[PDB]
Design a protein around this ligand. Structure first.
Ligand SMILES: CC1=C(/C=C/C(C)=C/C=C/C(C)=C/C(=O)O)C(C)(C)CCC1
Ligand code: NA
Length: 137
Protein backbone atom coordinates (compact mmCIF):
# COMPACT_ATOMS: atom_id res chain seq x y z
CA UNK A 1 0.00 0.00 0.00
CA UNK A 2 0.77 3.69 -0.60
CA UNK A 3 -0.60 5.76 2.28
CA UNK A 4 1.52 8.74 1.17
CA UNK A 5 -0.32 11.94 0.52
CA UNK A 6 -1.85 15.18 1.65
CA UNK A 7 -5.25 14.02 2.80
CA UNK A 8 -8.51 16.05 2.95
CA UNK A 9 -11.40 15.05 5.19
CA UNK A 10 -14.74 14.06 3.57
CA UNK A 11 -16.56 12.42 6.47
CA UNK A 12 -16.36 12.48 10.26
CA UNK A 13 -18.59 10.47 12.62
CA UNK A 14 -18.71 10.14 16.42
CA UNK A 15 -15.72 12.37 17.28
CA UNK A 16 -17.59 14.18 20.10
CA UNK A 17 -18.76 10.86 21.58
CA UNK A 18 -15.18 9.66 21.48
CA UNK A 19 -14.04 12.67 23.45
CA UNK A 20 -16.92 12.05 25.92
CA UNK A 21 -15.79 8.49 26.73
CA UNK A 22 -12.36 9.98 27.25
CA UNK A 23 -13.83 12.45 29.78
CA UNK A 24 -13.30 15.73 27.95
CA UNK A 25 -15.75 18.36 29.26
CA UNK A 26 -18.38 20.06 27.14
CA UNK A 27 -16.72 23.39 26.36
CA UNK A 28 -13.39 21.68 25.53
CA UNK A 29 -15.31 19.23 23.30
CA UNK A 30 -16.81 22.22 21.48
CA UNK A 31 -13.34 23.69 20.85
CA UNK A 32 -11.98 20.29 19.73
CA UNK A 33 -14.85 19.28 17.48
CA UNK A 34 -14.89 22.64 15.67
CA UNK A 35 -11.10 22.52 15.00
CA UNK A 36 -11.09 18.84 14.10
CA UNK A 37 -13.70 19.51 11.43
CA UNK A 38 -11.03 20.72 8.97
CA UNK A 39 -7.69 19.04 9.67
CA UNK A 40 -4.71 18.76 7.39
CA UNK A 41 -3.17 15.30 7.26
CA UNK A 42 0.24 14.66 5.73
CA UNK A 43 1.53 11.09 5.45
CA UNK A 44 4.92 10.01 4.12
CA UNK A 45 5.46 6.23 3.81
CA UNK A 46 8.62 4.40 2.84
CA UNK A 47 8.01 0.73 3.15
CA UNK A 48 6.81 0.04 6.69
CA UNK A 49 8.21 3.42 7.93
CA UNK A 50 5.70 6.23 8.38
CA UNK A 51 5.49 9.89 9.16
CA UNK A 52 2.03 11.23 9.94
CA UNK A 53 1.31 14.86 10.71
CA UNK A 54 -2.23 15.83 11.65
CA UNK A 55 -2.76 19.60 12.05
CA UNK A 56 -5.66 21.59 13.40
CA UNK A 57 -5.81 25.19 14.66
CA UNK A 58 -5.90 23.90 18.32
CA UNK A 59 -3.55 20.86 18.26
CA UNK A 60 -1.02 19.32 15.92
CA UNK A 61 0.65 15.96 16.27
CA UNK A 62 3.58 14.43 14.37
CA UNK A 63 4.41 10.76 14.72
CA UNK A 64 7.22 8.67 13.25
CA UNK A 65 6.97 4.90 13.48
CA UNK A 66 7.89 1.59 11.89
CA UNK A 67 5.20 -1.05 11.69
CA UNK A 68 6.02 -3.68 14.36
CA UNK A 69 8.27 -1.45 16.53
CA UNK A 70 6.98 0.20 19.67
CA UNK A 71 6.95 3.99 19.82
CA UNK A 72 5.57 6.81 22.00
CA UNK A 73 2.79 9.14 21.14
CA UNK A 74 -0.35 10.53 22.82
CA UNK A 75 -3.94 9.51 22.95
CA UNK A 76 -6.42 11.76 21.21
CA UNK A 77 -7.10 13.61 24.49
CA UNK A 78 -3.37 14.17 24.98
CA UNK A 79 -2.17 11.48 27.37
CA UNK A 80 1.24 9.91 26.76
CA UNK A 81 1.11 6.31 25.59
CA UNK A 82 3.20 3.53 24.14
CA UNK A 83 1.91 2.44 20.73
CA UNK A 84 2.47 -0.55 18.43
CA UNK A 85 1.26 -0.64 14.84
CA UNK A 86 0.69 -3.95 12.96
CA UNK A 87 -0.71 -4.86 9.55
CA UNK A 88 -4.17 -6.29 10.27
CA UNK A 89 -4.28 -6.87 6.50
CA UNK A 90 -2.48 -5.70 3.36
CA UNK A 91 -4.15 -2.29 3.35
CA UNK A 92 -4.99 -1.78 7.03
CA UNK A 93 -2.82 -0.92 9.96
CA UNK A 94 -3.95 -1.17 13.54
CA UNK A 95 -2.42 0.52 16.53
CA UNK A 96 -2.76 -0.60 20.14
CA UNK A 97 -1.98 1.96 22.84
CA UNK A 98 -1.07 1.69 26.54
CA UNK A 99 -0.97 4.70 28.86
CA UNK A 100 2.45 5.54 30.33
CA UNK A 101 0.84 6.68 33.59
CA UNK A 102 -2.47 5.98 35.19
CA UNK A 103 -5.69 4.45 34.02
CA UNK A 104 -8.30 5.17 31.37
CA UNK A 105 -10.33 3.74 28.50
CA UNK A 106 -8.61 1.21 26.23
CA UNK A 107 -7.63 3.22 23.17
CA UNK A 108 -6.56 2.29 19.67
CA UNK A 109 -6.62 3.54 16.09
CA UNK A 110 -6.69 2.04 12.60
CA UNK A 111 -5.87 3.41 9.15
CA UNK A 112 -7.00 1.61 5.98
CA UNK A 113 -6.71 2.36 2.30
CA UNK A 114 -9.99 1.34 0.70
CA UNK A 115 -10.50 0.02 -2.86
CA UNK A 116 -11.88 3.37 -4.02
CA UNK A 117 -8.67 5.24 -3.22
CA UNK A 118 -9.82 6.71 0.09
CA UNK A 119 -8.36 6.52 3.60
CA UNK A 120 -10.40 5.45 6.62
CA UNK A 121 -9.15 6.41 10.05
CA UNK A 122 -10.81 4.97 13.11
CA UNK A 123 -10.13 5.89 16.71
CA UNK A 124 -11.62 3.84 19.53
CA UNK A 125 -12.07 4.34 23.27
CA UNK A 126 -13.53 1.36 24.95
CA UNK A 127 -16.60 0.50 22.86
CA UNK A 128 -16.97 3.88 21.12
CA UNK A 129 -15.56 4.30 17.62
CA UNK A 130 -14.90 7.48 15.63
CA UNK A 131 -14.62 7.09 11.87
CA UNK A 132 -13.05 9.69 9.59
CA UNK A 133 -12.69 9.33 5.85
CA UNK A 134 -10.22 11.20 3.61
CA UNK A 135 -9.27 11.57 -0.04
CA UNK A 136 -6.00 13.10 -1.29
CA UNK A 137 -6.31 16.85 -1.96
C1 LIG B 1 -9.56 16.74 22.63
C2 LIG B 1 -8.99 17.97 23.22
C3 LIG B 1 -8.50 19.04 22.46
C4 LIG B 1 -8.43 18.99 21.02
C5 LIG B 1 -7.98 17.79 20.38
C6 LIG B 1 -8.12 17.72 18.96
C7 LIG B 1 -8.43 18.87 18.05
C8 LIG B 1 -7.96 16.41 18.41
C9 LIG B 1 -7.87 16.28 17.00
C10 LIG B 1 -7.75 14.88 16.60
C11 LIG B 1 -7.67 14.57 15.20
C12 LIG B 1 -7.81 15.57 14.09
C13 LIG B 1 -7.45 13.21 14.94
C14 LIG B 1 -7.34 12.73 13.57
O1 LIG B 1 -8.20 13.02 12.69
O2 LIG B 1 -6.31 12.09 13.27
C15 LIG B 1 -8.07 20.39 22.99
C16 LIG B 1 -6.87 20.91 22.21
C17 LIG B 1 -9.21 21.37 22.72
C18 LIG B 1 -7.77 20.25 24.48
C19 LIG B 1 -8.81 19.41 25.21
C20 LIG B 1 -8.91 18.00 24.70
NA1 NA C 1 2.18 -5.49 2.61
Amino acid sequence: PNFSGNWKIIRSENFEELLKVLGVNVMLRKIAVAAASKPAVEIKQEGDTFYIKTSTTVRTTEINFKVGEEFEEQTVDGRPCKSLVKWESENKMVCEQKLLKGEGPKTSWTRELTNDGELILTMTADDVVCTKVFVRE
